[PDB]
Amino acid sequence: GAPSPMMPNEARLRNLTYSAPLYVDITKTVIKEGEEQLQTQHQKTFIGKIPIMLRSTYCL
Amino acid sequence: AFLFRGMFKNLLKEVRIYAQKFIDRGKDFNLELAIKTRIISDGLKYSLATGNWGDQKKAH
Amino acid sequence: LRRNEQNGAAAHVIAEDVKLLQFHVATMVDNELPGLPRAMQKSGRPLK
RNA sequence: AGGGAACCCACUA
DNA sequence: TAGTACCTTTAAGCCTCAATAAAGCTT
DNA sequence: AAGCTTTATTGAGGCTTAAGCAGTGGGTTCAAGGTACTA
Secondary structure, three states, rough: OOOOOHHHHHHHOOOOOOOEEEEEEEEEEEEOOOOOOOEEEEEEEEEEEEOOOOOOOOOO | OHHHHHHHHHHHHHHHHHHHHHHOOOOOOOOOHHHHHEEEEEEHHHHHOOOOOOOHHHOO | HHHHHHHOOHHHHHHHHHHHHHHHHHHHHHHOOOOOOOOOOOOOEEOO
């Protein structure tokens, strides 16, 4: 479970997908009858892995 | 982006389905556990690997 | 359908099950009938 | 002494 | 109480409707 | 009398079926995740 920077050649050899993780921020506000709101911050939740085009900006 | 619009729409659909199932029970949901991160991941991976530009169930 | 006849049921239920049996026989013979769903498998590939 | 199918794509004349 | 097994593209034919018109039945 | 009514032609719409031959090769996915239930 430890993240390591995957090189494209290692992705070619090990049959991996050369993809980068996509993290998004969600703010959860709870509205309850007769009650206020609470804004909770889930910063950088993983929502998937975007395949990276080689030699683009977010390639290694 | 045409792929990612549909897959992010499906991500929000499954988040609303999960949270609806966990508010009809009168409980709280874990939002970091609500996100089905494999919707974007294997959807992009499938469409780039096969070349069919859509979902797995609409290959024709 | 035979079970729902022996464990007797509604005419609507028997009608729908006869309709499904008719669809299944027809798609076992021909799976290209227009104005009709394809007999696809769970993966979505239509049966031959 | 020989356990795959289907589809897609590229190609050959 | 954690864990494993099961539930669910177009081009040419043919056929079949609505719409007509002499012609016999009934003024 | 001139009105009424019936069986054979037309025109458009819908259905069906077809769309070259013979070769290589690769690539992917089929067969998949919730579950309901125990020793």
